[PDB]
């Protein structure tokens with residue numbers, strides 16, 4: 693499986709896969 697998190701900045705081990713809107717705020721959708 694793959695796991696993704698909405699983050700303001702992806703970790704170095706994660707791939708930035710599009711935008712996630714959190715509480716109205718633009719975040720990255722960070723997957724690994």
Ligand SMILES: [Cl-]
Nearest residue numbers: 693694695724
């Ligand atoms: Cl897995």
Ligand SMILES: [Cl-]
Nearest residue numbers: 693694695724
């Ligand atoms: Cl799986």
